[PDB]
Design a protein around this ligand. Structure first.
Ligand SMILES: CCCCCCCCCCCCCCCCCC(=O)OC[C@H](COP(=O)([O-])OCC(O)COP(=O)([O-])OC[C@@H](COC(=O)CCCCCCCCCCCCCCCCC)OC(=O)CCCCCCCCCCCCCCCCC)OC(=O)CCCCCCCCCCCCCCCCC
Ligand SMILES: CCCCCCCCCCCCCCCCCC(=O)OC[C@H](COP(=O)([O-])OCC(O)COP(=O)([O-])OC[C@@H](COC(=O)CCCCCCCCCCCCCCCCC)OC(=O)CCCCCCCCCCCCCCCCC)OC(=O)CCCCCCCCCCCCCCCCC
Ligand SMILES: CCCCCCCCCCCCCCCCCC(=O)OC[C@H](COP(=O)([O-])OCC(O)COP(=O)([O-])OC[C@@H](COC(=O)CCCCCCCCCCCCCCCCC)OC(=O)CCCCCCCCCCCCCCCCC)OC(=O)CCCCCCCCCCCCCCCCC
Ligand SMILES: CCCCCCCCCCCCCCCCC[C@@H](O)O[C@H](CO[C@H](O)CCCCCCCCCCCCCCC)COP(=O)(O)OCC[N+](C)(C)C
Ligand SMILES: CCCCCCCCCCCCCCCCC[C@@H](O)O[C@H](CO[C@H](O)CCCCCCCCCCCCCCC)COP(=O)(O)OCC[N+](C)(C)C
Ligand SMILES: CCCCCCCCCCCCCCCCC[C@@H](O)O[C@H](CO[C@H](O)CCCCCCCCCCCCCCC)COP(=O)(O)OCC[N+](C)(C)C
Ligand SMILES: CCCCCCCC/C=C\CCCCCCCC(=O)O[C@H](COC(=O)CCCCCCC/C=C/CCCCCCCC)COP(=O)(O)OCCN
Ligand SMILES: Nc1ncnc2c1ncn2[C@@H]1O[C@H](COP(=O)(O)OP(=O)(O)O)[C@@H](O)[C@H]1O
Lengths: 98, 104, 347, 320, 122, 49, 459
């Protein structure tokens, strides 16, 4: 594997790590979700272009579409949470325990 | 109210002899109680206890004890006349046994 | 929410699950998971009540993270072999990533934390759907890729799920958290036998689904979500508590009830593969589930708790809407052991 | 076809039934006022269904046969003995209050169901919204404990929040001495033991709290004793109200569908009246619960569902 | 692992292949069918119990439908199960036939020639 | 009797009763016919009769 | 064998279709007739068992157990109908249903040909027993007792299942005839040691073996009368029957794996017998005498000789009858004074003369007075133990001395001395109680004339 593939995979790992390690703002985590989607898009596009798989050229576009549905979903939830607390802090989501 | 709830008082037990001086202790209803007594006594003491014991006493000898005694008498008679040993040390014949090759 | 909108969201959830179940292309399986989650989020929020918003947000974050790892595993597998068909997963790093993503989706330990919270935060109908229908797609994927699954990782997560579900259920007074921990333990039982026999996995899933449906419908019939609220039901509908007690005993796995069939069928299978310690530990650990089922049975049916005066008014009214499949579900969850050999029809 | 999601999907809506005559009207006032006759006359003039004040045996009248049941199997409380001994150590006071609130909740659900299913307006005497004035007077006179008030507030908080308050609140204002004299004139030996402080507390709750927060969501029509008998004036006063303050115009077909799905199925209406809060006045031990429930089941029409009781003349049971 | 999921010539969603017609159908008095009917009867009784109707005699048409549906489903379930076990037996016998060196026929000694250890009980 | 006339009462819903009984008898007739066909086909394939 | 099973199953619809005041009569009559039918299984062969079908078979070991099981149901119904008077009709029918289901499970358990079916029925017997204890017991401890009953048993039997499906994977079958004919020795290895433990500990907990006998003084004490009767008379013998059945596969491994259990049994005999000397609860004393008696059955099964097996069968049957009678005798006094303290009601021989005779006969059979079958079984086990090692006579002799001491003590405390002055509600004995005692004691004495009927397959 060339250095570009490892750079893309490292980008995905950094974003996943960013998602997993929460700070305070919910939106900061939605941004890491978007970054994971972007890294997947670039990785799959590079693999598809390199092997000249013509039909697969439509799959990153599809991959983009469901990226928006996931973002629009998340932002929707971020609205409701904010409407309850006046803040998007994940500390407030502690009504339910394990 | 220093009570924690509304509850019935614990009721005192009923003596069956108060209303049925010959009560048999089976039921509050005298007729049902008397028939419970009669049916228990008849089907326990007259049927299972007596007829069942009689049935078990006269069971046929499927254990073959008299048969074994007769066979033993036959072989003791036969062996004694012959002069052969009354009982044999080995149940299974040696000729049909194939021991391993050698003792070492 | 409008009834037509609710109906179409339910159909979209089911359509996503079926899309996962009929696809041969990995991208379509991923799309089915995405479509399932998209329609699943509003069903959890049907009653607003901010605890539902919290449960929906936690569920969305967990499932989106799992979806991302799933997509990454798909792409790694494609990189190491130009293959999109769902098969034995030519790359082992991709296989580990895929197993972890599916374990997060199912809620196996240690990815199990979200199940009790989301289940407690949503309604009982939403909990029924979440704990029955949502398991079909990930388990159907795991059955397909089972041959390439690493036994050490899958069995580690299975044992952890059984232990953690059993331990967590002991501390619960809320009925929905009890159901969640029961679900975690049964998921562990399902996934322990998966590398050896997928027919046993399917059989356990079906029996667990009928038992969970019966239990959730009995909890909907008597609108109880706590132990003390359920302890009032003997004084209003004794038959419901009696059927609940028998269903709880079956869920415990006691013979001759239906619950026993899967465990009996899994242990035997694991003994044909020279696995002895694992089934013994799993069977001994399931006694924790049995204990906290027995405690609920003590609370609701085997003793009578004090009631309230206003309950008298409830004596004058009947349950209006009837669940037609509840009697069949109860009978199927209890009296089905004599037809165990019919499991051969699942392969 | 019982109303439900399927009937809503195919057509039926409730906004089309409303004809500006819906007007949920409640006619409040202190004890022994003229509010009953005013309510009946208002319901007669406006063509509205009247609801006599919900009492201890209200639920009996809507189920089985309308005949009241024994006090042991229904209510388990006595208004007469509340007047005889308000501070009795058997918990009769708060038990009566909590049972009466449950009966008022059931009556409000019945009235809402009638209005939402037929479009015809309903007149009520009191409601769950004014029930508390009897609770406060009980607590201020030292008849109930603070725990009883907290339990009442808990039950009210999770129940009264699921309904639309009335359009029109009619209050009949009669001073304490006049109702005292009316009580002395009526002849009921138990009712004469109402102290003046009790009635004064009821009026204080009505005027200080009930009417002020009733008047911020809809207009309140207060009347005196003499002008309350003049029913046509009150009816035409209601005829010229400008209802733009309450949430009733802010209701859609989906909210009405949710409300109608709630107002049928009385078991869901009464769900939170029996929450597992163990106060001595209302908690009943397991033995008494079992005995009284078995006694209830032995009643002539109560062992089975309404159409399945062979001993009240039901027939063709084996084919239902 | 799936033992027969991908058996050659298998129709994806058939539930009852044509070759299964070569097997004797289960008798209508099959004890398993009678147990399915008993399950249907119990479902009907519980239906009467939950709805607060006279348990034994409330709805005979409904109880009959419960029994009939359970028996009707059980008949085809039994057919599929019997066919699947017949397939397992067919494949196992064919594989033993086609791999003789893996299942060698062993000439068996008699107990007169085998030497078993004796462990006295004392 | 009852206060509310309790619409499902002594005259049962004859359409539903008829549908239930018809479904039961239709299932039974179909099952007997199916079993007869299965026996005939099994004997035909196995050279028994 | 279905000629016993199916009539037992018909007791359920018969009970549920009976009149409110006829359930006890119908159940008693028809359970007695089922006992009469069960008596036909005593006709046993000398060489092999009665192999009814592929599923059910009867041997000279299971036939007396079946007869005792069927005979116990009428006695339980007679003993239960007094304290369940104020109960509602449906709950009375539910109690009788629990008893009928228990009998059905036990009957199939004692005759199953295959060990997995035996295991499933032997575990199914837990559900009705637990429901009986925790729903109709009188005190608050009955809940805890239930848990102790449930988890002691299961923690023992869950490994057994794992062993059984293991064995079928290596030998090919779990049919008992095939298991016996195709038997092979157990090698001396750690895997075989743990397989031996998994096959044995489940039965040891049921006996129970001294050390894991804690559940029994709780469960028997807190249970209602029919619960304790069935727990002592039949449910304890499931462990003995299962151990006797499963020992064939165990040899020659049993010779050294039996030592810890033989030591535990031969010392816990003394321990529990001495515990009976200082016991303020009469029902608890009766419960502990059962552990002391079953230690002897454990010893007899572990030493693996024909005399020991005969003795163990005889002792299991005799103990079932005697312990059931003693529990009933204590319940007669409990239903008068509503306390299980032994010294609360004294001098009862003065007030209840014939029940005192019943007490005396039960105590005499408990201390194994010759020629009762209690003594026959005890003496056979003692002779076999003497053959196993002469020093055993010291422990065995000591147990006999102690057993007579706490038996007659139990007799002297409750029957002799002077009656307590305050109690004044001691009514004369009912015919129901007297007949319940007679139907316990007469079969016991009658079994002396034909002891070969209870001596098992080794006779
Ligand atoms: C191995 C073999 C075995 C396999 C086993 C498989 C698994 C077995 C089962 C697994 C577990 C199942 C769990 C089900 C959970 C469901 C949750 C739920 O509904 O709530 C519980 C519910 C609670 O009720 P409640 O709370 O009292 O009611 C209050 C209301 O909820 C209050 O709500 P409301 O006021 O809004 O009321 C609205 C109400 C009233 O309803 C109406 O008014 C109807 C209105 C009509 C509107 C029409 C809109 C049309 C426009 C939308 C179009 C959408 C298109 C989507 C597709 C897009 C494709 C790209 O509607 C509903 O209540 C729900 C409607 C359900 C609709 C179902 C849609 C099915 C979609 C199918 C998808 C697959 C299609 C193919 C895809 C192919 C791939 C692409 O009661 C139950 O459901 C009890 C449990 C029922 C379970 C059934 C038992 C299992 C199945 C047994 C039958 C046989 C099964 C096997 C079949 C074999 C093949 C033939
Ligand atoms: C290998 C085994 C072989 C056989 C299997 C046997 C096992 C059972 C059978 C299979 C399952 C049956 C399920 C259907 C029954 C459900 C209906 C019900 O609830 O019963 C109430 C009902 C009484 O209602 P009613 O008489 O209409 O009026 C009184 C009121 O309802 C007054 O009622 P209420 O509601 O007001 O009373 C309150 C009561 C109400 O509580 C109950 O009703 C309890 C219901 C039990 C739930 C059953 C769960 C589902 C089955 C699972 C069984 C597991 C089996 C494994 C072993 C473990 C056993 C636990 O609540 C309580 O008392 C609290 C006590 C809590 C104790 C906890 C124990 C409960 C579970 C024990 C179940 C044992 C079997 C039940 C026996 C039948 C009853 O009982 C019945 O009348 C039906 C019973 C059976 C009908 C027999 C009709 C057949 C006619 C003869 C045909 C002849 C055939 C041969 C032809 C040729 C002749 C010449
Ligand atoms: C050797 C004797 C010969 C007997 C001839 C035949 C007699 C047949 C009787 C069979 C036993 C009946 C069943 C017992 C329950 C009795 C029911 C009852 O309440 O009656 C009240 C009835 C009316 O009196 P009541 O004025 O209303 O009484 C008011 C109070 O209850 C006040 O009542 P109480 O103070 O009069 O108390 C009743 C009385 C009697 O009550 C009992 O004790 C009955 C139970 C006896 C002890 C059994 C448990 C100890 C373990 C050994 C079991 C051996 C079983 C042998 C086979 C039995 C087959 C049925 O108490 C005693 O006399 C002391 C009992 C201790 C006996 C000590 C000797 C034991 C060994 C004897 C040798 C055994 C083998 C003989 C053969 C040897 C080689 C030739 O009294 C009688 O009719 C007399 C009772 C019968 C006494 C027989 C004593 C000897 C029994 C030996 C065993 C049977 C052997 C038969 C074959 C020939 C030998
Ligand atoms: C109240 C006053 C008391 C005193 C007055 C009473 C008067 C005297 C009456 C007492 C009689 C004394 C007995 C003397 C012995 C004679 C009886 C003996 O001859 O019968 C035995 C027979 O006894 C029976 O074998 C034993 C009966 C079996 C008991 C079964 C009980 C019924 C079932 C109840 C269920 C209980 C569960 C049991 C679980 C296993 C002999 O057996 P056997 O040597 O062959 O017979 C040889 C001839 N045969 C073979 C042709 C028959
Ligand atoms: C608690 C008991 C379970 C209850 C289950 C629900 C009961 C209702 C039955 C559901 C109806 C649908 C099944 C039959 C309709 C057509 C079936 C056909 O279209 O599908 C076939 C499949 O047939 C089904 O698998 C058989 C369904 C039978 C289910 C019953 C078995 C239960 C196990 C035994 C427990 C005792 C139950 C007795 C009931 C009282 C296609 O086979 P195939 O596509 O190649 O396999 C797909 C999965 N693979 C490839 C991974 C293997
Ligand atoms: C209170 C009631 C509880 C129930 C009681 C159950 C009793 C279970 C006891 C099991 C009996 C014996 C088990 C194994 C046999 C020998 C064990 C050991 O002590 O002996 C030596 C074993 O050697 C060593 O000592 C290894 C064992 C040491 C480690 C085990 C720890 C035992 C400590 C006691 C723990 C308490 C047991 C109960 C737990 C709750 C024998 O010497 P060796 O020739 O080398 O080994 C031969 C055995 N082979 C043939 C299989 C190879
Ligand atoms: C009320 C308390 C009762 C307690 C009962 C619990 C003790 C039960 C005895 C042990 C149960 C597990 C045994 C497993 C079943 C045996 C089957 C078998 O033979 O498998 C062995 C394997 O045996 C084991 O693995 C068992 C090891 C132990 C695993 C679980 C540990 C449980 C605790 C052990 C000590 C406790 C036992 C005595 C305690 C008495 C009760 C206090 C060999 O198979 P293979 O692997 O194929 O070997 C040949 C080819 N290689
Ligand atoms: N919510 C309540 N709490 C306590 N007592 C009540 C309540 N409602 C009515 N009552 C009592 O019921 C009796 C009749 O009620 P009232 O409205 O004062 O006269 P009427 O309705 O007959 O014109 C009175 O004794 C009144 O105190």
């Amino acid at each position: 594997m060339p250095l570009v593939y490892m750079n893309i995979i490292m980008a995905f790992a950094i974003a996943l790590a960013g998602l997993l390690m929460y700070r305070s703002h919910l939106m900061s985590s939605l941004l890491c979700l978007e970054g994971m989607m972007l890294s997947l898009f670039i990785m799959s596009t590079l693999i598809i272009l390199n092997t000249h798989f013509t039909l697969a050229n439509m799959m990153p576009i599809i991959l983009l579409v469901f990226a928006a549905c996931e973002a629009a979903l998340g932002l929707s939830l971020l609205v409701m949470v904010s409407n309850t607390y006046g803040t998007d802090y994940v500390q407030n989501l502690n009504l339910l325990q394990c | 109210p220093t009570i924690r709830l509304q509850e019935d008082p614990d009721p005192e037990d009923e003596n069956l002899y108060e209303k049925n001086p010959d009560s048999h202790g089976y039921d509050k209803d005298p007729i049902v109680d008397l028939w419970n007594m009669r049916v228990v006594f008849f089907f326990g003491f007259s049927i299972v206890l007596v007829l069942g014991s009689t049935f078990v006493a006269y069971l046929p000898d499927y254990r073959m004890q008299e048969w074994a005694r007769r066979e033993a008498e036959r072989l003791v008679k036969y062996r004694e006349a012959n002069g052969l040993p009354l009982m044999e040390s080995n149940c299974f014949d040696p000729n049909k046994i194939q021991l391993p090759e050698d003792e070492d | 929410m409008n009834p037509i909108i609710y109906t179409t969201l339910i159909m979209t959830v089911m359509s996503g699950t079926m899309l996962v179940m009929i696809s041969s292309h990995w991208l379509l399986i991923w799309i089915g998971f995405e479509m399932n989650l998209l329609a699943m989020i509003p069903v959890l929020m049907k009653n607003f009540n901010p605890r539902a918003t919290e449960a929906a947000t936690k569920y969305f974050l967990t499932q989106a993270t799992a979806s991302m790892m799933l997509m990454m595993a798909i792409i790694i597998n494609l990189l190491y072999s130009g293959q999109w068909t769902i098969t034995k997963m030519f790359n082992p790093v991709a296989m580990t990533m895929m197993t972890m993503a599916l374990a997060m989706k199912l809620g196996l330990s240690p990815f199990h934390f979200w199940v009790p919270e989301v289940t407690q935060g949503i309604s009982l109908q939403a909990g029924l759907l979440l704990l029955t229908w949502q398991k079909l797609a990930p388990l159907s994927v795991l059955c397909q890729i089972s041959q390439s699954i690493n036994p050490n990782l899958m069995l580690t997560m299975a044992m952890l799920s059984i232990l953690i579900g059993g331990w967590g259920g002991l501390n619960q007074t809320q009925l929905r958290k009890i159901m969640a921990y029961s679900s975690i333990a049964h998921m562990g039982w399902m996934t322990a036998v998966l590398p050896y026999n997928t027919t046993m996995t399917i059989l356990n899933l079906l029996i667990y689904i009928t038992m969970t449906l019966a239990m959730f419908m009995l909890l909907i019939h008597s609108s109880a979500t706590t132990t003390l609220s359920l302890s009032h039901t003997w004084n209003k509908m004794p038959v419901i508590t009696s059927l609940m007690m028998v269903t709880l005993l079956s869920m415990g796995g006691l013979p001759p009830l239906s619950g026993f069939m899967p465990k009996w069928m899994i242990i035997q299978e694991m003994t044909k593969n020279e696995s002895i310690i694992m089934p013994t530990l799993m069977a001994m650990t399931a006694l924790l589930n049995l204990y906290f089922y027995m405690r609920l049975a003590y609370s609701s049916s085997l003793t009578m708790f004090p009631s309230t005066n206003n309950m008298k008014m409830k004596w004058q009214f009947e349950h209006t809407k009837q669940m037609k499949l509840l009697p069949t579900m109860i009978v199927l969850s209890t009296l089905v052991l004599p037809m165990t050999p019919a499991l051969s029809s699942l392969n | 076809l019982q109303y439900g999601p399927l009937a809503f999907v195919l057509g039926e809506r409730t906004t089309r039934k409303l004809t500006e005559t819906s007007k949920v009207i409640t006619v409040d006032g202190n004890i022994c006022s003229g509010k009953g006759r005013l309510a009946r006359e208002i319901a007669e003039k406006l063509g509205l269904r009247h609801f006599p004040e919900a009492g201890i045996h209200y639920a009996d009248s809507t189920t089985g046969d309308g005949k009241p049941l024994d006090v042991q199997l229904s209510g388990n409380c006595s208004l007469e003995k509340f007047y005889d001994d308000p501070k009795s150590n058997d918990g009769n006071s708060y038990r009566l209050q909590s049972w009466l609130y449950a009966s008022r909740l059931l009556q409000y659900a019945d009235a809402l169901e009638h209005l939402l299913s037929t479009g015809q307006g309903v007149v009520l005497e009191r409601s769950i919204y004014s029930d508390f004035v009897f609770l406060e007077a009980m607590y201020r006179q030292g008849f109930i404990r603070k725990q009883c008030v907290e339990h009442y507030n808990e039950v009210k908080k999770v129940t009264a929040c699921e309904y639309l308050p009335p359009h029109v609140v009619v209050y009949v204002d009669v001073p304490v001495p006049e109702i005292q004299s009316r009580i002395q004139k009526k002849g009921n030996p138990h009712e004469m033991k109402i102290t003046a402080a009790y009635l004064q507390d009821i009026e204080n709750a009505y005027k200080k709290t009930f009417l002020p927060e009733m008047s911020e969501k809809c207009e309140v029509l207060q009347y005196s004793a003499r002008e309350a008998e003049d029913a046509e004036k009150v009816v035409e006063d209601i005829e010229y109200l400008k209802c733009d303050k309450g949430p009733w115009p802010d209701q859609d077909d989906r909210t009405f569908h949710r409300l109608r799905m709630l107002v049928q199925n009385k078991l869901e209406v009464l769900n939170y009246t029996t929450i597992p809060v163990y106060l001595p006045e209302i908690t009943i031990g397991a033995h008494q619960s079992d005995r009284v429930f078995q006694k209830f089941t032995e009643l002539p029409g109560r062992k089975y569902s309404p159409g399945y009781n062979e001993d009240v003349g039901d027939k063709w049971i084996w084919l239902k | 692992m799936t033992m027969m999921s991908g058996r050659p010539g298998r129709v994806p969603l058939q539930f009852l292949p044509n070759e299964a017609r070569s097997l004797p159908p289960p008798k209508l008095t099959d004890p398993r069918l009678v147990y399915m009917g008993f399950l249907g009867y119990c479902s009907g009784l519980i239906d009467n119990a939950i709805r607060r109707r006279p348990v034994v005699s409330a709805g005979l048409h409904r109880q009959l439908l419960y029994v009939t549906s359970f028996v009707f489903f059980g008949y085809y379930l039994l057919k599929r199960q019997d066919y699947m076990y017949a397939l397992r037996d067919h494949d196992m016998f064919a594989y033993v036939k086609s791999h003789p060196e893996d299942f060698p026929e062993k000439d068996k000694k008699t107990y007169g020639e085998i030497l078993e250890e004796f462990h006295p009980v004392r | 009797k009852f206060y509310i006339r309790e619409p499902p009462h002594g005259s049962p819903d004859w359409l539903k009763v008829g549908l239930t009984l018809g479904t039961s008898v239709f299932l039974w007739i179909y099952l007997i016919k199916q079993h007869k066909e299965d026996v005939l086909e099994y004997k035909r394939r196995n050279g028994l009769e | 064998m279905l000629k016993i099973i199916i009539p037992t199953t018909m007791l359920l619809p018969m009970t549920w279709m009976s009149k409110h005041n006829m359930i006890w009569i119908n159940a008693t009559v028809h359970s007695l007739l089922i006992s009469l039918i069960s008596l036909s299984l005593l006709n046993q062969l000398g060489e092999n068992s009665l192999n009814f079908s592929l599923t059910f078979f009867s041997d000279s070991l299971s036939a007396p157990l079946l007869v005792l099981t069927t005979w116990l149901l009428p006695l339980m119904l007679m003993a239960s109908q007094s304290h369940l008077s104020k109960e509602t009709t449906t709950r009375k029918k539910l109690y009788i249903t629990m008893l009928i289901l228990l009998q059905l499970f036990l009957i199939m358990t004692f005759t199953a040909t295959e060990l997995i079916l035996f295991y499933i029925l032997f575990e199914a017997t837990l559900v009705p027993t637990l429901i009986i204890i925790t729903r109709w017991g009188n005190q608050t401890e009955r809940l805890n007792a239930g848990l102790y009953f449930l988890f002691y048993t299961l923690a023992g039997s869950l490994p057994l299942l794992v062993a059984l499906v293991y064995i079928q994977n290596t030998t090919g079958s779990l049919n008992f005839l095939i298991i016996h004919y195709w038997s092979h020795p157990l090698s001396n290895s750690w895997s075989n040691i743990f397989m031996w433990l998994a096959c044995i500990m489940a039965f040891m907990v049921k006996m129970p073996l001294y050390g894991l006998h804690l559940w029994l003084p709780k469960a028997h004490v807190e249970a209602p009368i029919a619960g304790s009767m069935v727990l002592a008379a039949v449910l304890l013998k499931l462990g003995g029957y299962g151990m006797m059945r499963i020992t064939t596969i165990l040899n020659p491994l049993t010779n050294y794996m039996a030592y810890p259990f033989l030591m535990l049994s031969m010392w816990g005999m003394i321990m529990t017998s001495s515990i009976c000397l200082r016991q303020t609860d009469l029902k608890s004393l009766i419960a502990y005498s059962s552990v002391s008696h079953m230690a002897l059955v454990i010893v007899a099964i572990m030493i693996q000789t024909p005399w020991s097996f005969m003795g163990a069968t005889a002792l299991m049957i005799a103990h079932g009858l005697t312990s059931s009678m003693l529990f009933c005798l204590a319940n007669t006094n409990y239903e008068r004074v509503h306390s299980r303290t032994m010294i609360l009601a004294r001098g009862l021989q003065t007030l209840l003369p014939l029940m005192a005779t019943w007490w005396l006969v039960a105590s005499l059979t408990n201390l194994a007075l010759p020629p009762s079958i209690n003594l026959i079984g005890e003496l056979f086990i003692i002779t076999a133990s003497f053959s196993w090692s002469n020093i055993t006579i010291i422990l065995m002799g000591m147990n006999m001395m102690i057993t007579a001491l706490y038996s007659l003590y139990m007799l002297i405390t409750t029957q002799r001395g002077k009656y307590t002055h305050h109690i004044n509600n001691i009514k004369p004995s009912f015919t129901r109680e007297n007949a319940l005692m007679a139907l316990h004691i007469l079969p016991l004495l009658l079994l002396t004339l034909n002891p070969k009927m209870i001596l098992g397959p080794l006779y």
